[PDB]
Design a protein around this ligand. Structure first.
Ligand SMILES: *[C@@H]1O[C@H](CO)[C@@H](O)[C@H](O)[C@@H]1O
Ligand SMILES: *[C@@H]1O[C@H](CO)[C@@H](O)[C@H](O)[C@@H]1O
Ligand SMILES: [Ca+2]
Lengths: 48, 48, 487
């Protein structure tokens, strides 16, 4: 899909084969964050 | 009296990092008819 | 051919060294003074003469094997390697009388491809692997799982990393030039009266055409990278045994044979690859002349008429292909005259993974192998070997060789110089060609050895070698004169 020059607009054959492959390995596109420092509970001296 | 002259140059320089050894030499084999790359060879490189 | 061949000469002999305390022999040697060329007769004599001795000087040759003596090879191996289920001595000695054996490798594990080939030192001047210097069948425990694709491998103890580093380049050029010319010039003149008349004609053509096509396509494929460890190395026993046979006295001939048998330098870092160079070079020409004339008189009458018509066409074409890694079925089809269909190219590169050549390599002088944990009087053997290495470079460097015709390249294997002939010229000196002329590339004579101490100088000339005859290429690759401190 990244190779497609795009002059036609989307070639649905390639876009669908890519989209099926996106089911097989995604990427984070948008995200909701909490700060790292809220996580930690196992470690000795955790609170400190 | 008549005079005529012509000139042509082509240079092309595919470069690759990562890929399986055969797929690399496959993709990088320059096509005069398709200088960016044959889409299946390119997809195979992108697999390897 | 314009030849009278050059037969070999070695020098008149050195004086003998005094008898070596530890080798109990004495040695005499000669310099190679003029190599065999044009099929002039060899005089090689294996470059040496040696004799036994009766002297009684003390010798300290007993550097202790701390672990276990490998009975046949004279190697030592550390005691954790006995009964490891592996041949650490070369001749399986270490695995004798094992009250139990302990295995380590849980699976079969290939040697990385060519890893035993990298184990050998190079003659840097012929650019050749000569023979075996480090034991790339030695595994020191080892058995760490390494993978390339899905294949699994064992790394020789001597090697720091063998890793795919999987890189590829293609570089292509195509060029065309063309030029055309056509000229036509005419005359006509007439007279008449009532009786007499006259006529004259000329017609002409001159024409020319030229073309070149040039194509070059190169691929470099680099699908392993080797680095050897800096030191703590484990030597191949055949090298180790000539090193234990070197004199502590200095006499260059015995040291010369180590460089012949085991190379001048050991390979420390190399990129491991396939190359597929293709070049196609074409020059094409055509020419014509046409010319036509008449003259007439009338009074009685006379006619004259002439034609002259001419054509030439030619092509000179050369193609070269070099391929340096892969498997023989792919290698031959790539080596075919046609630009390779990308399936071939794929199957070739896939096999480069299994049989590379060295693409680029960084090498260390072999005396850094010679070490106090491995040899007695080691530092004297090093200093000797350093001097011999410099004298050997002066012998193996090609400069003695008389110039090839047709821009041929000398490589000076053994003690013969043979001119490698390019495409389009043939014969012993590369003389025999259909072509008018060829550009020549420059190289010097052998450099003058040194001037005096307190600032020292070396000097070079190109008297026969030079580019200007028949309009050659570059004269140079380094400094046309050279100077240094004495210390
Ligand atoms: C060493 O070399 C010279 C040169 O041929 C010989 O006369 C003789 O072998 C000498 O000992
Ligand atoms: C003579 O001396 C140098 C040594 O630095 C050689 O490398 C070279 O051949 C030069 O002419
Ligand atoms: Ca063993």
């Amino acid at each position: 899909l990244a190779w497609e020059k795009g002059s036609s607009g989307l070639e649905e054959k390639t876009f669908s084969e890519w989209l099926e492959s996106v089911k097989e390995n995604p990427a984070v596109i948008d995200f909701e964050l909490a700060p790292i420092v809220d996580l930690v509970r196992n470690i000795p001296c955790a609170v400190t | 009296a008549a005079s005529g002259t012509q000139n042509n140059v082509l240079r092309g320089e595919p470069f690759i990092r990562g890929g399986g050894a055969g797929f690399i030499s496959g993709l990088s084999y320059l096509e005069l008819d398709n200088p960016a790359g044959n889409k299946r060879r390119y997809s195979a490189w992108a697999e390897s | 051919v314009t030849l009278m061949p050059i037969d070999c000469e070695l020098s008149s002999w050195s004086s003998w060294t005094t008898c070596d305390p530890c080798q109990k022999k004495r040695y005499r040697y000669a310099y190679l003074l003029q190599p065999s060329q044009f099929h002039g007769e060899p005089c090689n004599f294996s470059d040496k003469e040696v004799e036994d001795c009766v002297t009684n000087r003390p010798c300290r040759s007993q550097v202790r094997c701390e672990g276990f003596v490998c009975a046949q090879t004279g190697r030592c191996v550390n005691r954790r390697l006995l009964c490891n289920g592996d041949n650490d001595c070369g001749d399986q000695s270490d695995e004798a009388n094992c009250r139990r054996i302990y295995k380590k490798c849980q699976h079969e594990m290939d040697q990385y491809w060519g890893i035993g080939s990298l184990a050998s030192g190079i003659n840097l001047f012929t650019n050749s692997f000569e023979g075996p210097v480090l034991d790339h069948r030695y595994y020191a425990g080892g058995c760490s799982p390494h993978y390339i694709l899905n294949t699994r491998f064992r790394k020789p103890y001597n090697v720091e990393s063998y890793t795919p580093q999987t890189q590829g380049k293609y570089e292509f050029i195509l060029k065309e030039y063309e030029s055309y010319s056509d000229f036509e010039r005419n005359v006509t003149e007439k007279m008449a009266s009532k009786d007499r008349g006259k006529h004259y004609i000329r017609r002409t053509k001159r024409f020319s055409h030229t073309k070149s096509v040039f194509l070059h396509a190169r691929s470099d494929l680099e699908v392993a990278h080797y680095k050897l460890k800096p030191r703590s190395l484990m030597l191949h026993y055949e090298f180790l045994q000539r090193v234990k046979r070197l004199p502590l006295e200095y006499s260059y001939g015995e040291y010369r044979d180590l460089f012949r048998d085991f190379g001048t330098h050991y390979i420390t870092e190399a990129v491991l690859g396939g190359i597929y160079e293709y070049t196609l070079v074409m020059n094409k020409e055509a020419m014509e002349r046409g010319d036509y004339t008449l003259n007439n008189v009338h009074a009685r009458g006379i006619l004259n008429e002439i034609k002259d018509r001419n054509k030439r066409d030619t092509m000179v074409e050369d193609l070269v292909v070099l391929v340096r890694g892969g498997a023989s079925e792919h290698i031959t089809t790539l080596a075919y005259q046609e630009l390779p269909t990308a399936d071939l190219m794929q199957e070739w590169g896939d096999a480069v993974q299994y049989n590379p050549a060295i693409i680029k390599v960084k090498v260390e002088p072999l005396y850094e192998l010679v070490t106090a944990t491995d040899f007695a009087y080691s530092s004297t053997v090093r200093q000797n070997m350093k001097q011999a290495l410099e004298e050997f470079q002066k012998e193996v460097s090609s400069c003695h060789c008389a110039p090839c015709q047709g821009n041929g390249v000398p490589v000076l294997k053994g003690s013969r110089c043979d001119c490698i002939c390019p495409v389009g010229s043939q014969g012993l000196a590369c003389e025999v060609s259909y072509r008018k002329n060829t550009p020549i590339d420059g190289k010097w004579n052998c450099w003058s050895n040194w001037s005096s101490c307190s600032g020292r100088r070396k000097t070079r000339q190109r008297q026969c070698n030079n580019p200007p005859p028949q309009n050659g290429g570059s004269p140079c690759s380094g400094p046309a004169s050279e100077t240094l401190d004495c210390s």
